Amino acid sequence: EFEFPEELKTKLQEHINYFPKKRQAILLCLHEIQNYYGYIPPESLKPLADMLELPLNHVEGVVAFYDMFDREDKAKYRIRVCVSIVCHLMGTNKLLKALENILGIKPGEVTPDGKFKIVPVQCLGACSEAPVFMVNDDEYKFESEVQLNEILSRYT
Amino acid sequence: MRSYPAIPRIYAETTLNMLLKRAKKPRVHSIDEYLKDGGYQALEKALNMSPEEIIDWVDKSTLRGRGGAGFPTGKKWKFAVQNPGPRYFICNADESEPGTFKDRIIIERDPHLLIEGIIISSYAIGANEAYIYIRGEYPAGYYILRDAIEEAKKKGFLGKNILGSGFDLEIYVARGAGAYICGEETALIESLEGKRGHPRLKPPYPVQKGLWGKPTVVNNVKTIANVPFIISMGWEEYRYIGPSDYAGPKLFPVSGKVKKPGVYELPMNTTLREVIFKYAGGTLGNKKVKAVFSGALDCFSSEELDIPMDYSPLGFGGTGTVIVLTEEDDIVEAALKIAEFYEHETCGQCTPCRVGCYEQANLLEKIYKGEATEQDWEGFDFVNRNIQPTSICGLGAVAGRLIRQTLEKFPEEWEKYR
Ligand SMILES: Cc1cc2c(cc1C)N(C[C@H](O)[C@H](O)[C@H](O)COP(=O)(O)O)c1[nH]c(=O)[nH]c(=O)c1N2
Ligand code: SF4
Ligand code: FES
Ligand SMILES: [Cl-]
Ligand code: NA
Ligand code: NA
Ligand code: NA
Ligand code: NA
Ligand code: NA
Ligand code: NA
């Protein structure tokens, strides 16, 4: 049915073998799956459940609770934009407008080429450098459209 | 050069040169650089002391918890060791409260200060397994800690029989996945056990029953970071730092409408006005301060800036998180943003919290957009005052607090929306 590629199952095992108990590796395993596929593929949950020795029900409940995980839309690059108090005061709306101008999309949306998804997030813990956004693991202050444009050009 | 994700360079400044001695510089300080400033020597000293003596120094330091409840650290460790082992040690690195970005700079720039304090702390309480739980939106920190932990192992500060003391320790690093509740200590533990982050009814406290039912100390990153200093200087010198009653360095994350936003290591006798004007360089455009939001906990007006930044009955308290709003900033729109945070972060266990956080935000948006009925207004008032009942953690206790304060201190601005 659904089996994980060899290069990926290796990494999941690394995670599972890392903590004293297998089940502690669920969040790291799910970060890995999402890093590999662009999202959490719904068919990945059953095989992972078996590797963690957990019920499928349990795993699905976990995916639902943790916001970073996305079971709906594949994207090569997730642009996490902070929509909390400080970034709002300092121009979250200017960043979103600039993202619309450049990429043609709004929060929740994916480019048609499946390259960028914009994900509104809560405070990213960089409030002094507001307004804040992440492109996958990379984090940045927004300054201008021109500056935004140059940064995004680095993601191919 | 070992490359980590891009991180903004948060500005950091210190008058005390302690938790920020290295972290005032926006770069990773690795083990050789840490060893050169006498790093890991407080560990070596601590390993020549009894666990009990360490507990006793930390107690006499008057060190209190920096995750924002201010519980005495030495007393917490005493409670854990009065219960039978095995015992567990957890560094709480979830930092997800709005306006809060101080714990991350220690992690990213001075990982070894933190690691050193974890080892001393673990030995003090007899724990042979420790954990850092770091939020998932802190990827660079995760990778920086993993590498620093390996450096520490290579140089022999982790593993079995650390420096011939007979004391074993492994530090495991866990990541979060988008939930502020997983910063609440019991919810954090549930997540470490591979579950959803639902808080447990307390008591029991984790020091009695925590990870796998066993005695567990949860301490905040910054709390732990003070431990190497207490062992290094002695408890007497630590208590000479700042006020007699509020001893030690405090990190203050200053954000919003200020000229110099960032992290300030200051003593606790500092006032809120001194933080914004003396340290953070005043306001953007020299506009008048309207309000300070203490993270998502409290709202101070411009008439309450000359309070001290201590746990004083009349002090700022909280975590010293200073978000500044100036005269042209819509307080109602700001409250909405605070309402939206709690709505996204309630775990749903308690019913008044689940529905109250939802409805507070839903109704406050109706108000903000001018589409609220008379009843929508009166309902909003009611729910804001009734999120707390039956709540098992502090989220539901505070989710209406800041907003209530805006209603009471900025009534004229709310009436404009009516
Ligand atoms: C909603 C919510 C959220 C958080 C907390 C509490 C609550 C109710 N706590 C505090 C936590 O429960 C506990 O006090 C600390 O983990 C222990 O810290 P000390 O080291 O004693 O300060 C908390 N503490 C911390 O270290 N980091 C965090 O991000 C949070 N977040
Ligand atoms: S008070 Fe709210 S966040 Fe806390 S346990 Fe209850 S429902 Fe969850
Ligand atoms: S409010 Fe946006 S990073 Fe904190
Ligand atoms: Cl602090
Ligand atoms: Na972040
Ligand atoms: Na270095
Ligand atoms: Na988290
Ligand atoms: Na959310
Ligand atoms: Na809105
Ligand atoms: Na209505």
The architecture in CATH of the region B331-415 reads Up-down Bundle (1.20)
Residue from B238, B228, B253 nearest B114 by CA:
B228
**Contact residues on chain A for B137, CB-CB shorter than 8 A:** 68, 80, 121, 124-125, 134
Question: In a 10 Å sphere around its CB, with 0-12 CB exposed, 13-18 middle and 19+ buried, how is residue A3 labelled?
Answer: exposed
Binding residues of A for [2Fe-2S] cluster: 82, 87, 123, 127
**Contact residues on chain B for A66, CB-CB shorter than 8 A:** 136, 176-179
- Min Cα distance B313 → chain A (Å) is 27
Is A123–B135 a contact, with Cβ atoms under 8 angstroms apart?
no
Beta strand A138-141 pairing with A132-135: antiparallel
Residue from B2, B5, B21 nearest B13 by CA:
B21
- Residue of chain B minimizing CA distance to A34: B177
Token representation of residue A146: 């021109």
List the domain boundaries for chain A.
2-73, 74-156
Which residue in B95, B135, B194 is closest to A26 by CB distance? B194
B185 lines ligand 1 (CB under 6 A): yes
Token representation of residue B7: 């991180």
SS (H, E, C) B69-137: CCCEHHHHHHHHHCCCCCEEEEEEECCCCCCCCCHHHHHHHCHHHHHHHHHHHHHHHCEEEEEEEECCC
The answer for residues whose C-beta is within 8 angstroms of residue B228's C-beta and 6 or more apart is B42, B43, B113, B116, B117, B120
- Asked if B315 contacts B294 with a C-beta cutoff of 8 angstroms, the reply is no
- Asked if B41 contacts B121 with a C-beta cutoff of 8 angstroms, the reply is no
Residues carrying CATH 3.40.50.11540, chain B = 11-238
Residues carrying CATH 1.20.1440.230, chain B = 331-415
Residues carrying CATH 3.10.20.600, chain B = 250-326
- Min Cα distance B333 → chain A (Å) is 9
Experimentally, the structure was elucidated by X-ray
Resolution (A): 2.5
Please name the residue ranges forming H helices in B165-295: 185-192, 221-225, 227-233, 235-238, 272-273
Is CATH 1.10.1500.10 correct for B250-326?
no
Ligand 2 atom closest to Cα of residue B184: 4
Fold of B11-238: Rossmann fold (3.40.50)
Tokens 């101008």 belong to A101
